[PDB]
């Protein structure tokens, strides 16, 4: 098996943190996990889609 | 300094078992994608199991159903309980730190321990 992004969840920015509820592929929702933006850098543009929406629902 | 320390190898049977640590310093394990890497005498080095920084874990398709990783953060440690082992499972294993979920590239990494089934 691989980490293998189904859909981006979540959303959050506190702590010191970026992090992004991810569901993965493969997998159900009993495992969903929180991860660093940083580790997830080669979905970059999806990232940045994510941030913008959740920016413009949260306005 | 960044340091990995790996332990928990030896001799064992056809069917034993072994249960591997990686003793981590000066970083938190919990932030970085770790990665059990083996590599046979003879052989290429192979990934067998991840940790994600959020917990999500994945295992080699050879292995799975018989190890199992983990790690304590209070101990900033991470496992690899290896049960059922066959003579192929002889390998040096060794912990990695990664930052990547797609790839298992790695820029520290321990300096191994031997595991030898016969």
């Not at chain 1, 980490?3 to 929702?29: A, H, N, P």
């Not at chain 2, 069917?15 to 994608?33: E, P, Q």
């Not at chain 2, 005498?41 to 920084?53: C, N, Q």
């Not at chain 2, 440690?77 to 298992?104: H, I, W």
Request: aromatic fraction near 10%; proline fraction near 3%; charged fraction near 25%.
């Amino acid at each position: 098996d691989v980490f293998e992004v189904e859909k981006i969840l979540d959303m959050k920015t506190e702590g010191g943190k970026v992090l992004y509820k991810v569901r993965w592929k493969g997998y159900t929702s009993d495992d969903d996990t929180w991860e660093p933006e940083i580790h997830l850098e080669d979905c970059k543009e999806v990232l940045l889609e994510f941030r913008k929406k959740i920016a413009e629902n949260k306005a | 300094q960044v340091q990995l320390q790996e332990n928990g190898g030896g001799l064992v049977k056809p069917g034993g078992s072994l249960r591997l640590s990686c003793a981590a310093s000066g970083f938190t394990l919990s932030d970085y994608v770790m990665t059990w890497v083996r590599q046979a005498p003879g052989k290429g080095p192979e990934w067998v199991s991840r940790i994600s920084a959020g917990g999500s874990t994945r295992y080699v398709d050879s292995v799975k159903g018989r190890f199992t990783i983990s790690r304590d953060n209070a101990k900033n440690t991470m496992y690899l309980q290896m049960n059922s082992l066959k003579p192929e499972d002889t390998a040096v294993y060794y912990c990695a730190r990664g930052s990547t979920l797609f790839s298992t590239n790695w820029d520290y990494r321990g300096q191994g321990t031997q595991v030898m089934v016969s």
